[PDB]
PDB file of all heavy atoms in Angstrom:
ATOM      1  N   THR H  46       8.006   0.007 -14.315  1.00  0.00           N
ATOM      2  CA  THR H  46       7.635  -1.015 -15.297  1.00  0.00           C
ATOM      3  C   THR H  46       6.303  -1.690 -14.944  1.00  0.00           C
ATOM      4  O   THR H  46       5.791  -1.527 -13.831  1.00  0.00           O
ATOM      5  CB  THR H  46       8.751  -2.078 -15.458  1.00  0.00           C
ATOM      6  OG1 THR H  46       9.120  -2.592 -14.172  1.00  0.00           O
ATOM      7  CG2 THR H  46       9.981  -1.473 -16.127  1.00  0.00           C
ATOM      8  N   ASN H  47       5.747  -2.441 -15.897  1.00  0.00           N
ATOM      9  CA  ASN H  47       4.445  -3.099 -15.721  1.00  0.00           C
ATOM     10  C   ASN H  47       4.414  -4.215 -14.666  1.00  0.00           C
ATOM     11  O   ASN H  47       3.366  -4.467 -14.063  1.00  0.00           O
ATOM     12  CB  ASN H  47       3.899  -3.607 -17.064  1.00  0.00           C
ATOM     13  CG  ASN H  47       4.863  -4.541 -17.786  1.00  0.00           C
ATOM     14  OD1 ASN H  47       5.928  -4.892 -17.271  1.00  0.00           O
ATOM     15  ND2 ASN H  47       4.488  -4.945 -18.995  1.00  0.00           N
ATOM     16  N   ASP H  48       5.553  -4.875 -14.447  1.00  0.00           N
ATOM     17  CA  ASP H  48       5.668  -5.918 -13.413  1.00  0.00           C
ATOM     18  C   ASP H  48       5.901  -5.345 -12.001  1.00  0.00           C
ATOM     19  O   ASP H  48       6.200  -6.082 -11.054  1.00  0.00           O
ATOM     20  CB  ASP H  48       6.739  -6.957 -13.789  1.00  0.00           C
ATOM     21  CG  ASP H  48       8.106  -6.336 -14.041  1.00  0.00           C
ATOM     22  OD1 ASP H  48       8.821  -6.036 -13.061  1.00  0.00           O
ATOM     23  OD2 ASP H  48       8.466  -6.146 -15.223  1.00  0.00           O
ATOM     24  N   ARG H  49       5.751  -4.027 -11.887  1.00  0.00           N
ATOM     25  CA  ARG H  49       5.840  -3.285 -10.621  1.00  0.00           C
ATOM     26  C   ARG H  49       7.241  -3.242  -9.996  1.00  0.00           C
ATOM     27  O   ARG H  49       7.399  -3.398  -8.782  1.00  0.00           O
ATOM     28  CB  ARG H  49       4.777  -3.752  -9.614  1.00  0.00           C
ATOM     29  CG  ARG H  49       3.344  -3.491 -10.058  1.00  0.00           C
ATOM     30  CD  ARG H  49       2.384  -3.533  -8.879  1.00  0.00           C
ATOM     31  NE  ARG H  49       1.015  -3.818  -9.302  1.00  0.00           N
ATOM     32  CZ  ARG H  49       0.404  -4.990  -9.146  1.00  0.00           C
ATOM     33  NH1 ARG H  49       1.032  -6.005  -8.563  1.00  0.00           N
ATOM     34  NH2 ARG H  49      -0.843  -5.147  -9.570  1.00  0.00           N
ATOM     35  N   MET H  50       8.248  -3.029 -10.840  1.00  0.00           N
ATOM     36  CA  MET H  50       9.580  -2.640 -10.385  1.00  0.00           C
ATOM     37  C   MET H  50       9.681  -1.124 -10.459  1.00  0.00           C
ATOM     38  O   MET H  50       9.178  -0.509 -11.398  1.00  0.00           O
ATOM     39  CB  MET H  50      10.677  -3.261 -11.256  1.00  0.00           C
ATOM     40  CG  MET H  50      10.822  -4.774 -11.146  1.00  0.00           C
ATOM     41  SD  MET H  50      10.974  -5.402  -9.461  1.00  0.00           S
ATOM     42  CE  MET H  50      12.573  -4.766  -8.965  1.00  0.00           C
ATOM     43  N   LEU H  51      10.322  -0.522  -9.464  1.00  0.00           N
ATOM     44  CA  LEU H  51      10.559   0.916  -9.473  1.00  0.00           C
ATOM     45  C   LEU H  51      12.056   1.196  -9.429  1.00  0.00           C
ATOM     46  O   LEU H  51      12.708   0.981  -8.406  1.00  0.00           O
ATOM     47  CB  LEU H  51       9.831   1.604  -8.308  1.00  0.00           C
ATOM     48  CG  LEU H  51       9.856   3.138  -8.217  1.00  0.00           C
ATOM     49  CD1 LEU H  51       9.082   3.797  -9.350  1.00  0.00           C
ATOM     50  CD2 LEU H  51       9.308   3.597  -6.880  1.00  0.00           C
ATOM     51  N   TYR H  52      12.590   1.660 -10.555  1.00  0.00           N
ATOM     52  CA  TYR H  52      13.994   2.033 -10.663  1.00  0.00           C
ATOM     53  C   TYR H  52      14.149   3.509 -10.305  1.00  0.00           C
ATOM     54  O   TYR H  52      13.521   4.374 -10.919  1.00  0.00           O
ATOM     55  CB  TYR H  52      14.521   1.741 -12.074  1.00  0.00           C
ATOM     56  CG  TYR H  52      14.341   0.296 -12.499  1.00  0.00           C
ATOM     57  CD1 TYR H  52      13.195  -0.116 -13.179  1.00  0.00           C
ATOM     58  CD2 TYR H  52      15.315  -0.662 -12.210  1.00  0.00           C
ATOM     59  CE1 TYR H  52      13.021  -1.444 -13.561  1.00  0.00           C
ATOM     60  CE2 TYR H  52      15.152  -1.990 -12.587  1.00  0.00           C
ATOM     61  CZ  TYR H  52      14.004  -2.375 -13.262  1.00  0.00           C
ATOM     62  OH  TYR H  52      13.842  -3.689 -13.638  1.00  0.00           O
ATOM     63  N   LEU H  53      14.970   3.781  -9.294  1.00  0.00           N
ATOM     64  CA  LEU H  53      15.176   5.140  -8.796  1.00  0.00           C
ATOM     65  C   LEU H  53      16.566   5.640  -9.162  1.00  0.00           C
ATOM     66  O   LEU H  53      17.555   4.929  -8.980  1.00  0.00           O
ATOM     67  CB  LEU H  53      14.966   5.191  -7.279  1.00  0.00           C
ATOM     68  CG  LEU H  53      13.563   4.843  -6.761  1.00  0.00           C
ATOM     69  CD1 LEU H  53      13.638   4.070  -5.456  1.00  0.00           C
ATOM     70  CD2 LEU H  53      12.682   6.081  -6.614  1.00  0.00           C
ATOM     71  N   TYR H  54      16.632   6.867  -9.674  1.00  0.00           N
ATOM     72  CA  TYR H  54      17.868   7.414 -10.231  1.00  0.00           C
ATOM     73  C   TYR H  54      18.219   8.789  -9.684  1.00  0.00           C
ATOM     74  O   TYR H  54      17.414   9.720  -9.755  1.00  0.00           O
ATOM     75  CB  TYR H  54      17.766   7.507 -11.753  1.00  0.00           C
ATOM     76  CG  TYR H  54      17.519   6.195 -12.456  1.00  0.00           C
ATOM     77  CD1 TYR H  54      16.257   5.879 -12.958  1.00  0.00           C
ATOM     78  CD2 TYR H  54      18.552   5.276 -12.641  1.00  0.00           C
ATOM     79  CE1 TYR H  54      16.029   4.677 -13.620  1.00  0.00           C
ATOM     80  CE2 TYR H  54      18.334   4.071 -13.298  1.00  0.00           C
ATOM     81  CZ  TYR H  54      17.073   3.778 -13.784  1.00  0.00           C
ATOM     82  OH  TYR H  54      16.861   2.585 -14.436  1.00  0.00           O
ATOM     83  N   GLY H  55      19.435   8.911  -9.159  1.00  0.00           N
ATOM     84  CA  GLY H  55      19.961  10.191  -8.696  1.00  0.00           C
ATOM     85  C   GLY H  55      19.430  10.621  -7.343  1.00  0.00           C
ATOM     86  O   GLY H  55      18.222  10.789  -7.170  1.00  0.00           O
ATOM     87  N   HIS H  56      20.347  10.794  -6.391  1.00  0.00           N
ATOM     88  CA  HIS H  56      20.041  11.281  -5.041  1.00  0.00           C
ATOM     89  C   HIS H  56      18.883  10.555  -4.360  1.00  0.00           C
ATOM     90  O   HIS H  56      17.951  11.187  -3.850  1.00  0.00           O
ATOM     91  CB  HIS H  56      19.804  12.796  -5.044  1.00  0.00           C
ATOM     92  CG  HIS H  56      21.010  13.592  -5.430  1.00  0.00           C
ATOM     93  ND1 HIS H  56      21.135  14.204  -6.659  1.00  0.00           N
ATOM     94  CD2 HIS H  56      22.153  13.863  -4.755  1.00  0.00           C
ATOM     95  CE1 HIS H  56      22.299  14.825  -6.721  1.00  0.00           C
ATOM     96  NE2 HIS H  56      22.936  14.633  -5.580  1.00  0.00           N
ATOM     97  N   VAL H  57      18.953   9.224  -4.361  1.00  0.00           N
ATOM     98  CA  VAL H  57      17.952   8.390  -3.697  1.00  0.00           C
ATOM     99  C   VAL H  57      18.058   8.559  -2.185  1.00  0.00           C
ATOM    100  O   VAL H  57      19.147   8.472  -1.611  1.00  0.00           O
ATOM    101  CB  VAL H  57      18.093   6.892  -4.069  1.00  0.00           C
ATOM    102  CG1 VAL H  57      16.939   6.089  -3.495  1.00  0.00           C
ATOM    103  CG2 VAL H  57      18.138   6.712  -5.571  1.00  0.00           C
ATOM    104  N   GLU H  58      16.915   8.815  -1.556  1.00  0.00           N
ATOM    105  CA  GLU H  58      16.842   9.002  -0.113  1.00  0.00           C
ATOM    106  C   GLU H  58      15.594   8.304   0.438  1.00  0.00           C
ATOM    107  O   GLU H  58      14.474   8.547  -0.017  1.00  0.00           O
ATOM    108  CB  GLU H  58      16.837  10.496   0.223  1.00  0.00           C
ATOM    109  CG  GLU H  58      17.329  10.839   1.622  1.00  0.00           C
ATOM    110  CD  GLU H  58      17.630  12.322   1.800  1.00  0.00           C
ATOM    111  OE1 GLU H  58      18.341  12.900   0.950  1.00  0.00           O
ATOM    112  OE2 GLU H  58      17.159  12.905   2.800  1.00  0.00           O
ATOM    113  N   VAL H  59      15.810   7.414   1.401  1.00  0.00           N
ATOM    114  CA  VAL H  59      14.737   6.709   2.090  1.00  0.00           C
ATOM    115  C   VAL H  59      14.684   7.245   3.521  1.00  0.00           C
ATOM    116  O   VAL H  59      15.720   7.403   4.167  1.00  0.00           O
ATOM    117  CB  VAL H  59      14.980   5.180   2.097  1.00  0.00           C
ATOM    118  CG1 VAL H  59      13.852   4.452   2.800  1.00  0.00           C
ATOM    119  CG2 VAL H  59      15.131   4.654   0.680  1.00  0.00           C
ATOM    120  N   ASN H  60      13.481   7.540   4.001  1.00  0.00           N
ATOM    121  CA  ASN H  60      13.299   8.102   5.334  1.00  0.00           C
ATOM    122  C   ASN H  60      12.183   7.402   6.087  1.00  0.00           C
ATOM    123  O   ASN H  60      11.083   7.235   5.558  1.00  0.00           O
ATOM    124  CB  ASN H  60      12.990   9.601   5.256  1.00  0.00           C
ATOM    125  CG  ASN H  60      14.122  10.404   4.648  1.00  0.00           C
ATOM    126  OD1 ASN H  60      15.103  10.724   5.318  1.00  0.00           O
ATOM    127  ND2 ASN H  60      13.983  10.743   3.369  1.00  0.00           N
ATOM    128  N   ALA H  61      12.477   6.990   7.319  1.00  0.00           N
ATOM    129  CA  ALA H  61      11.454   6.496   8.228  1.00  0.00           C
ATOM    130  C   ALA H  61      10.588   7.665   8.683  1.00  0.00           C
ATOM    131  O   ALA H  61      11.102   8.719   9.065  1.00  0.00           O
ATOM    132  CB  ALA H  61      12.088   5.808   9.413  1.00  0.00           C
ATOM    133  N   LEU H  62       9.274   7.474   8.614  1.00  0.00           N
ATOM    134  CA  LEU H  62       8.315   8.495   9.025  1.00  0.00           C
ATOM    135  C   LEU H  62       7.676   8.141  10.367  1.00  0.00           C
ATOM    136  O   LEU H  62       6.867   8.903  10.906  1.00  0.00           O
ATOM    137  CB  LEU H  62       7.244   8.688   7.945  1.00  0.00           C
ATOM    138  CG  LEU H  62       7.710   9.105   6.547  1.00  0.00           C
ATOM    139  CD1 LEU H  62       6.595   8.885   5.554  1.00  0.00           C
ATOM    140  CD2 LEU H  62       8.180  10.552   6.513  1.00  0.00           C
ATOM    141  N   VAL H  63       8.060   6.979  10.898  1.00  0.00           N
ATOM    142  CA  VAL H  63       7.580   6.488  12.191  1.00  0.00           C
ATOM    143  C   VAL H  63       8.715   6.450  13.221  1.00  0.00           C
ATOM    144  O   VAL H  63       9.814   5.987  12.910  1.00  0.00           O
ATOM    145  CB  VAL H  63       6.920   5.081  12.068  1.00  0.00           C
ATOM    146  CG1 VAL H  63       5.560   5.181  11.385  1.00  0.00           C
ATOM    147  CG2 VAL H  63       7.835   4.086  11.332  1.00  0.00           C
ATOM    148  N   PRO H  64       8.454   6.933  14.454  1.00  0.00           N
ATOM    149  CA  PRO H  64       9.487   6.970  15.499  1.00  0.00           C
ATOM    150  C   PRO H  64       9.977   5.588  15.945  1.00  0.00           C
ATOM    151  O   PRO H  64      11.101   5.465  16.432  1.00  0.00           O
ATOM    152  CB  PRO H  64       8.783   7.678  16.663  1.00  0.00           C
ATOM    153  CG  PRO H  64       7.332   7.461  16.421  1.00  0.00           C
ATOM    154  CD  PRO H  64       7.174   7.486  14.935  1.00  0.00           C
ATOM    155  N   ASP H  65       9.140   4.567  15.768  1.00  0.00           N
ATOM    156  CA  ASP H  65       9.438   3.206  16.239  1.00  0.00           C
ATOM    157  C   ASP H  65      10.128   2.328  15.183  1.00  0.00           C
ATOM    158  O   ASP H  65       9.640   1.248  14.833  1.00  0.00           O
ATOM    159  CB  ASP H  65       8.168   2.527  16.796  1.00  0.00           C
ATOM    160  CG  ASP H  65       6.938   2.732  15.905  1.00  0.00           C
ATOM    161  OD1 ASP H  65       7.003   2.422  14.694  1.00  0.00           O
ATOM    162  OD2 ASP H  65       5.900   3.205  16.421  1.00  0.00           O
ATOM    163  N   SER H  66      11.265   2.810  14.684  1.00  0.00           N
ATOM    164  CA  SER H  66      12.078   2.077  13.717  1.00  0.00           C
ATOM    165  C   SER H  66      13.543   2.429  13.929  1.00  0.00           C
ATOM    166  O   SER H  66      13.902   3.606  13.947  1.00  0.00           O
ATOM    167  CB  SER H  66      11.656   2.419  12.286  1.00  0.00           C
ATOM    168  OG  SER H  66      12.531   1.835  11.336  1.00  0.00           O
ATOM    169  N   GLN H  67      14.383   1.409  14.086  1.00  0.00           N
ATOM    170  CA  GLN H  67      15.808   1.623  14.355  1.00  0.00           C
ATOM    171  C   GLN H  67      16.586   2.152  13.146  1.00  0.00           C
ATOM    172  O   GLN H  67      17.593   2.838  13.309  1.00  0.00           O
ATOM    173  CB  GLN H  67      16.461   0.357  14.920  1.00  0.00           C
ATOM    174  CG  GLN H  67      15.970  -0.007  16.323  1.00  0.00           C
ATOM    175  CD  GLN H  67      16.887  -0.969  17.076  1.00  0.00           C
ATOM    176  OE1 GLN H  67      16.670  -1.243  18.257  1.00  0.00           O
ATOM    177  NE2 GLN H  67      17.915  -1.479  16.398  1.00  0.00           N
ATOM    178  N   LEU H  68      16.104   1.836  11.945  1.00  0.00           N
ATOM    179  CA  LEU H  68      16.693   2.314  10.693  1.00  0.00           C
ATOM    180  C   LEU H  68      16.003   3.601  10.236  1.00  0.00           C
ATOM    181  O   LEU H  68      14.824   3.583   9.877  1.00  0.00           O
ATOM    182  CB  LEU H  68      16.571   1.230   9.622  1.00  0.00           C
ATOM    183  CG  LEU H  68      17.041   1.524   8.202  1.00  0.00           C
ATOM    184  CD1 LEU H  68      18.556   1.484   8.114  1.00  0.00           C
ATOM    185  CD2 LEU H  68      16.419   0.522   7.254  1.00  0.00           C
TER     186      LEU H  68
END
Side-chain angles (χ1 to χ4, degrees):
Chain H
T46 52
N47 56 4
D48 56 80
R49 296 199 203 105
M50 292 309 292
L51 185 67
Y52 304 91
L53 297 143
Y54 301 104
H56 296 106
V57 187
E58 204 166 311
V59 181
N60 297 280
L62 301 165
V63 287
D65 45 54
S66 173
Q67 292 198 173
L68 176 76

